[PDB]
Design a protein around this ligand. Structure first.
Ligand code: 3SE
Ligand code: 3SE
Lengths: 184, 184
């Protein structure tokens, strides 16, 4: 199973999921094709599992943090920059699969809701302690900022035109987060 | 031609481009199917033209503006909220078509570059006159803010989970723009 997952992530670096066959996956894993079907129903199920592992790893890293204001936010944004930036091929294939796969769509949406709720809870705590002003509803502010990070990180990692260069994206997002949370 | 375009926009309200046939389009336009092929090579070419007209209408409305700081930005963001919000079916189909169509991809990318360049020029003017502090590189700040607006507007219009409610999205974006441009 782990060899099929590593193989899939390796090939995804080079080509889209549409250009990878079960045969390629089976072969890279040192197993036959019907032996593949024993571990996964499809190549789409492989990507789902890869995406699930990356998002959970980001989510666990953020839990570890939960357990200087600008540096506080930078470190939390950085969990996502590093975790997804270390898995760009999976990130990119997984984002494209939100369009065609309900399971990938639901997976992404469920974790965005969780990460928005955590951001909102931290902004509310900051407001409760007098460190942040009561401007926008916290949960709405958190939603826009998180959607910004999703779109901006993924555009930078994919080398999209337009995008912020990967080496400038963390400072760019942290500035927008800190000014909008503390400003006002 | 205009009847084929209106028909396509009308049907897109109800269903995806994949569930619309040339026959549906031809029929709604009061023409035969080979008569359709005379005006457009495909249903994908129809969406391209619809998207082209919407983006140009937004772009022309923003030119009209180019020819109170918070209200200045609100009015510019509002061109996009109203123009795309008045054409949600076309916006939504057009965004999904960026994945499968190079012409739709290039069209969106070309206008984002133009709208980023305009935002950056206004922030630079604001900094030149002493009204905004010299924090992030203007063009990087503009890129992240514009990508935020793209993702956040389209999520609100599609009723995505998560999204900012459509009735709160303009105030949410304006707050993030004004604090990040003038803050720090
Ligand atoms: O960037 C994200 C998530 C959106 C993305 F596309 F990237 F998946 N976040 C979500 C969690 C945010 C957050 N950080 C923290 C904290 N960081 C440090 C202490 S508490 N709380 O919420 C950081 C940015
Ligand atoms: O929201 C956008 C474009 C991104 C989108 F997804 F929506 F297409 N804009 C681009 C242009 C921005 C802008 N406004 C202005 C001005 N508004 C009033 C005077 S000058 N300059 O740039 C406003 C937000």
């Amino acid at each position: 199973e782990l060899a099929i997952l590593a193989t899939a992530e390796n090939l995804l670096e080079d080509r889209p999921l549409a250009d990878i066959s079960v045969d390629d996956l089976a072969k890279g894993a040192g197993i036959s094709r019907p032996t593949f079907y024993f571990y996964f129903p499809s190549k789409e199920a492989v990507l789902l599992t890869l995406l699930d592992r990356v998002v959970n790893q980001a989510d666990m890293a953020l839990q570890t943090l939960a357990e200087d204001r600008e540096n506080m936010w930078r470190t939390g944004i950085n969990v996502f920059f590093e975790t997804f930036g270390s898995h760009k091929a999976v990130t990119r294939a997984g984002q494209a699969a939100r369009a065609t796969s309900v399971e990938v769509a639901e997976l992404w949406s469920t974790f965005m809701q969780k990460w928005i709720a955590y951001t909102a809870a931290v902004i509310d705590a900051e407001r409760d302690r007098g460190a942040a002003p009561r401007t926008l509803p916290a949960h709405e502010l958190a939603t826009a900022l998180n959607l910004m990070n999703e779109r901006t990180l993924f555009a930078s990692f994919a080398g999209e035109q337009p995008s912020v260069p990967e080496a400038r994206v963390l400072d760019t997002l942290v500035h927008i987060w800190v000014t909008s949370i503390y400003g006002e």
